[PDB]
């Protein structure tokens, strides 16, 4: 019927609904190559699906908000990996070796009092 996966990358949020059909991808009611597939983060969304070779098998309807180009594509990446339970689990066992099933703990550290940002300290005098 439907195969769902949420996914997040540090500021973003997506809903990846995998429905059977053609190999196209619909993102924010628009095509993949139009939004950012000809520029930065072009094939990061294809890395989970490249291992299983699902070229014309499943259509993905995705709605994503938050972050930027990389953040939205990372939310789509973790959404596809979470939504990869559509068939038997013998294919995600090799996808774990790639490192995309693992949720990245790389998130921004807060600003602290006395500092200009996360870890930068003010300049100390020479004498």
What does the binding site for other proteins look like in residue numbers (CB under 8 A)?
Answer: 39-44, 110, 113-114, 122
Restricted to residues 32-61, the positions that interact with RNA (CB under 7 A) are: 35, 39-41
Q: Which residues contact 114 (CB under 8 A, 6 or more apart)?
A: 121, 122
Q: Is 84 among the residues that bind RNA (CB under 7 A)?
A: no
- Give the strands of the sheet with 13-20, arranged side by side: 3-5, 13-20, 58-65, 25-27
Among 66, 85, 86, 91, binds RNA (CB under 7 A): 66
Q: Which residues contact 1 (CB under 8 A, 6 or more apart)?
A: none
Residues that bind RNA (CB under 7 A): 4, 6, 8-15, 28, 35, 39-41, 63, 65-72, 74, 93, 96, 101-126
């Amino acid at each position: 019927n439907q195969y769902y996966g949420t996914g997040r990358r540090k500021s973003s949020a997506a809903r990846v609904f995998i429905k059977p059909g053609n190999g196209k991808i619909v993102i924010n009611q628009r095509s993949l190559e139009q939004y950012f597939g000809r520029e930065t983060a072009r094939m990061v969304v294809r890395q989970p699906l490249e291992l299983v070779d699902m070229v014309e098998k499943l259509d993905l309807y995705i709605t994503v908000k938050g972050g930027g180009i990389s953040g939205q594509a990372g939310a789509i990446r973790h959404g596809i990996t979470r939504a990869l339970m559509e068939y038997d689990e013998s294919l995600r066992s090799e996808l774990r070796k790639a490192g995309f099933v693992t949720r990245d703990a790389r998130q921004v550290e807060r600003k602290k009092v006395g500092l200009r940002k996360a870890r930068r300290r003010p300049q100390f005098s020479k004498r």
